[PDB]
Design a protein around this ligand. Structure first.
Ligand SMILES: [Ca+2]
Ligand SMILES: [Ca+2]
Ligand SMILES: [Ca+2]
Ligand SMILES: [Ca+2]
Ligand SMILES: [Ca+2]
Ligand SMILES: [Ca+2]
Ligand SMILES: [Ca+2]
Ligand SMILES: [Ca+2]
Ligand SMILES: [Cl-]
Lengths: 329, 329, 329, 328, 329
RNA sequence: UUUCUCUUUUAUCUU
RNA sequence: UUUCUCUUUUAUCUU
RNA sequence: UUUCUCUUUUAUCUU
RNA sequence: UUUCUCUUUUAUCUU
């Protein structure tokens, strides 16, 4: 309506990459409409993955603002949550290496910093009505990457400081604000900027595990562990400003839970002049006051998650909220 | 008609008999003569849960603060024995209120009193694999004490906490709801006293019978083990009857579901607690609500299938208006 | 005139520049673009305090969550030295939010952002015994890091938290309020950044410089010791300038008083926390309030005598209406 | 609407020629109105370029340092075997002491407003040879995490500059022209807002002392030298300007280099600089969107000839966008 | 609103994005500047098809006249290899237009140009036996040539038809539709050029790479074999992106269905052909439809479930009217 | 995401 | 390339 | 513990 | 198999 005409082309595209379904959004948009207009590279990451769930085991999936990695998972005994004895393994978006090299010290070779725009996820059951069982629970945690300070009895004695994931503890309880339906109904949900503005984040070098090498989980406070594995295949290149989507998928004993898992990521990077990437860059979109306030509203308005069913009805549900709040203004 | 109830008095009746998924501030409080400062804690649990075949799983919704329910499974067609031990499943943030040591429960709050205690089981299995039933009855479980002597030097007499009325779980009460598993169930408990008196927070309790106490001395039929003092524990016993749920899963039956639990509790906050910030005066006496509460409770069925969880609030309002009608004559 | 501000936008301006002894829900939140779930924590300290004669007592109102202020006394006519260490005085319920171990701060909440930071000193001594003065200035104390090498095997390079700008406490800033002790004082701090960005909760910090770190390596002029990890600690550093208060008590002077401290802080709650129950969406952007906030702040005096603590809200409203007047022309 | 006095000054310090007696202005017009001290750093460096060499000058958001210079054989770029040495702005010590732990003694934090650079050839017309090439790099100061086998075993975390690998090649978006023609270029805030960065203590080298260049990922090294003459006091949010003066064999390339820098620092009450401090200018939406627009519009760099016709390029853009938006 | 389109211009948009099961004369033609004599050929295929378990069957909707689709199956979880060959499934009456010898295609018609290319998959299996998924993306497959030398006497240089962009089938494109098998799917392709230029009929083509040509010389990743020149063949390559459909059938899964394909094609008839009798002038330029066509195409999702095949025409009309609205402002 | 009344029942802005 | 009525007789757009 | 308007701004009860 | 308008848009019958 008179709302969809106030937005700039960029402003609109932005809002779609953010809440629109993967199929509808054929155009990632020139990026984020805000004060920043420097050279960037918009990359819409998309993972499609046929996954089958282990029976008699609850599998936890974490979607975090980590570049080049779609999600992190780990399976635990049914009815339980992660423990110190738990470790999450990352699943890379296509071409993670082509972006962040193959050695924990060559992440900032292609790009120096970044900032997330959208970060969606969906689960589409593919089991027949004679085999499905279990539930899909979803909530979001405000996990941020900080640091911890502690002394070390070396010679001479020294004080350490390393990266720690703060608020990870939230994954050990299903917060009151959550989605939770039968497995068969699938689920669809997005995440948004947990900051007043879209500030860029630095690319992080050498990060492979958290707690890192030579550090006890005890000294970090983190409830469980994060392992990206062989530096040559994956790794932790940074941590964005998006709350982390948590997903508990309960699979009963003798239940066949097969589904497709999808993941979106509209990320804006700062290309290095040397990168064979740079030639695809352009300038960040101009500020679009409207789109920005719409984003915030839509975001806070939308439900935790929705069933897979209404994934398409999503874009519409959104376009509704916009005209509704832009009408009362 | 429902305009004879104070704002809170009404809210109260809702927190009580209806699952207020609706995000009201969680309850106002109890419309009783007491109007001192309290904190209305709205506890809510969402637990995905798969039931093992050939087992009759027992769940207890007890008035133990911080713990949503306790369970244990016994072979099909059987009930708990001395050889049985129930393990508690805490509501989110248990430690955030009761600490991590059996002697730091009274740190945050000093006493409490329950207002509502609801529970629902929503099947998540398919229609070809499920089988079995859900049976429900309620037990007048109170928390007393046992007095016995010990041959020490010098010989002395002991006294410890013992749960009376537990023997009620060893059989399916006559007043009960029993129906096919797939149909789920919703049920709630109520104040088993003429008034809403406050109970003290109990320090040191982690197991019943207590460690170093031989079972049967107490006379309890089975055991209650909350586990690590740093993860869970028994902080008190409310004046609510305990809800018993027997879910018998036959052989080769894939019965999964989602369990939800609600608990409106008025706690007396301690000034040194941050939690105290959210304290308000308890609602003023609302003679009408207190008389309705009683009437509604006595009316409602032991439990109902999951489906009628919605029609719940409505079913209540009609019982009220129907009661307020007879009051005019 | 003051009707151009959203309900919260106004509330915000009050929590900010006025001591809201009034029992509003403690603040609404910040009227910034951010609208994610937060918990408005209204911290308030009431500390009776007697000042030792012949000593110039220094108090620091720092943006360290959970700690109202830090103090230490130096001989009259002098300032802190390397030989000085400041001990924190926590707001009530510090542990109730940050635990009892330097690695359990991020348990309850993950990040935060201050909104208000006020402090008042109300003399309680008689008019025949008091003597001395209260001087006040504000320091742009930020929390950076220091990089230095260590002769270990193998030799390595360290990096630890160091407080920059502390040197500002060693002298009475030119922009300052200074007046007789008996006249008391009220003053508040404000966001030392163009926006309200969130800061991470910091794990492990108990002292600065950190244990095992020689003072001066950091370059700090004195030390910060929070003490037992089980009683206090340093959980983060807000983007507020620190308030410095020098209360010089001459020889034989009986100077006693009551100190009050207020702090509106928006924290990002963790779903597993009970505290999360009281979370709400941050207030929507209120362009006007954000522009007023800035204007009011720049206007107000460094500080004012205790007496004008009341006329505070009024003094503010007039500054606003006076600013909104010039906006019409 | 129109610009404020400060909002206009802000746009001049930003892209305005320094021969215009440019006013530092009151600073940056944004939401922030806190006490700050405006410093207009200017360096004039007479310099001769080694023939058969390709000298690399880097303009980085390092306070008190005008630029970092290193040289490599003609036709090549910096390598692991390279180290850049900083040339300080006047009175570096008067601001950040003489110890690697005396930086935060005068000011606690800062934020850049402008960062320009100019090269004015002084060579005659037959003696000179070579070319000047410019491109900008999004170099940011991050951190690296690696383990160390000490007793007991530990994990080490330190500063590491990311995006330096961009200096090892000539960015597609670049200015390239004959040496003699000189050059002028400027950088802008690489962030949506002008946030404050803290002052950094103890930084003298990167990789730091006791760290191999291999542990950092950094393609080469950064050395400020004697903690009593220079050092790294912080890293601002401005893209780093890269200038490659390619001098061939037998080429006499002499020239002057100027470096501008409008910085807003948060003064320490105890510092002498505090008396000079005022409040940051009130937010000026117009200027903040002009700055952003002018920046994106301007070319990477221009020959030193158009250093005066610079201000007029800007005034033009200012009203050419204040025109496509003034109609409706 | 939809009255700004010429009769044909509208018809055109329907033949294009909607399955016109409705028996209109099959399309009017293309509302482009061209108005010479053409014959609107409405190709439609109805193919019953059962998918083998443990195989990931691949289907290609290519702009090859007379052939509805090409398929081949690869082991589950895998894609085509050099060892793969796709076999074409012709629309009815292939020979009735292109003869029975690779050198009699240009007999009936000389050139052509596609207008629509739609495809739908409607599951026919029960809800207890099906399993698996349907994934869809589109490839910019064009038909180029490869130049290489041959050691003959005298030695010479060759040149033959090679399909470029086929490598796109070896992976699931990011812009894709993926959902449970049972949900079916509908999708259509569009002109991958700025205009509707005519393509020549190609004589002699039966296989790619051509007989006597070693695979890989061409650089194609797999092979295309139309078979007997008297039953099928490759008569040309339209300027439409090719539609890729991966139907993964897990082990023991009974996945059957019905596939439908539509193709509006404008051919230039030859006077000696009887077919020429049904030729008419191409529709006159309809600037509006040509601009809508483009807009509608860009909007629609990669694909949609079979169910929304009906709501298709409607979904389109709304996109149009919505576009024509913004054109007034 | 839909429609108002009614009393709610808090909550500030103003005399 | 010319002029309208008439019923044609299909054909969509709209309720 | 005092006086109303005003818009607040949430919040249920009712069609 | 249902209801008309509207312009369609072809198509003959008639001057
Ligand atoms: Ca922790
Ligand atoms: Ca009593
Ligand atoms: Ca007994
Ligand atoms: Ca910011
Ligand atoms: Ca110092
Ligand atoms: Ca590198
Ligand atoms: Ca053409
Ligand atoms: Ca190839
Ligand atoms: Cl796959």
């Amino acid at each position: 309506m008179a709302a969809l005409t106030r937005l700039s082309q960029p402003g609109l595209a932005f809002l779609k990459c953010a809440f629109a379904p993967p199929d509808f959004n054929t155009d990632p948009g020139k990026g984020i409409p805000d004060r920043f207009e420097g050279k960037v590279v918009s990359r819409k990451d998309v993972l499609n993955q046929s996954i089958s769930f282990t029976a008699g085991q609850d599998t936890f999936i974490l979607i975090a603002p980590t570049p080049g990695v779609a999600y992190w998972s780990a399976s635990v005994p049914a009815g339980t949550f992660p423990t110190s004895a738990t470790t999450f393994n990352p699943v890379n978006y296509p071409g993670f290496t082509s972006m962040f090299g193959t050695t924990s010290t060559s992440r900032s070779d292609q790009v120096s910093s970044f900032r997330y725009a959208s970060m969606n996820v969906g689960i589409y059951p593919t089991s027949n009505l004679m085999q499905f069982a279990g539930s899909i629970t979803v909530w979001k945690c405000p996990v941020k990457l900080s640091t911890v300070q502690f002394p070390v009895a070396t010679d001479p004695a020294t004080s350490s400081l390393v990266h720690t994931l703060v608020g990870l503890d939230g994954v050990l309880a299903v917060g009151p604000d959550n989605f939770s339906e039968s497995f068969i109904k699938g689920v669809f949900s997005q995440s948004a900027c947990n900051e007043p503005d879209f500030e860029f984040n630095d690319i992080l070098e050498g990060i492979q595990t958290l707690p890192p090498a030579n550090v006890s989980l005890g000294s970090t406070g983190q409830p469980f562990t994060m392992d990206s594995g062989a530096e040559a295949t994956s790794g932790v290149v940074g941590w964005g400003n998006m709350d982390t989507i948590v997903i508990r998928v309960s699979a009963p004993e003798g239940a066949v839970n097969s589904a497709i898992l999808k993941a979106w990521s509209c990320i804006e990077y700062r290309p290095n002049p040397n990168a064979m990437l740079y030639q695809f860059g352009h300038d960040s979109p101009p500020l679009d006051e409207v789109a920005l306030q719409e984003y915030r509203t839509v975001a806070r308005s939308l439900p935790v998650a929705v069933i897979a069913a209404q994934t398409a009805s999503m874009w519409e549900r959104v376009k509704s909220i916009i005209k509704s709040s832009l009408a009362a203004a």
